[PDB]
Symmetry: C2
Subunit: 48 residues, 2 copies
């Protein structure tokens, strides 16, 4: 049981790290989405 506890703590550390990276990449995705929408609007306006 102690060995299992140690291994799973070693796992939870990576759990927290991965959660933080997920949050960061989600924010980056949101920023990229707004940038893409703005570029699409510019392209459309140039079209008209």
């Amino acid at each position: 049981l102690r060995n299992d506890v140690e291994r799973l703590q070693l796992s939870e550390e990576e759990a927290k790290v991965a959660t933080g990276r997920v949050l960061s990449l989600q924010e980056e995705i949101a920023k990229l989405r707004k940038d893409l929408e703005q570029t699409r609007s510019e392209k459309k306006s140039i079209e008209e």
Copy 2:
């Protein structure tokens, strides 16, 4: 020790969920970057 194992196994499940999420977010980052690049190129060509 059993309580610790159960809690840390839940955290390990969170680790797996975060790994899947980070992979999906990386894929969406690539997709957004590609869409932005093509939209920029199209708008530049239309403007020219």
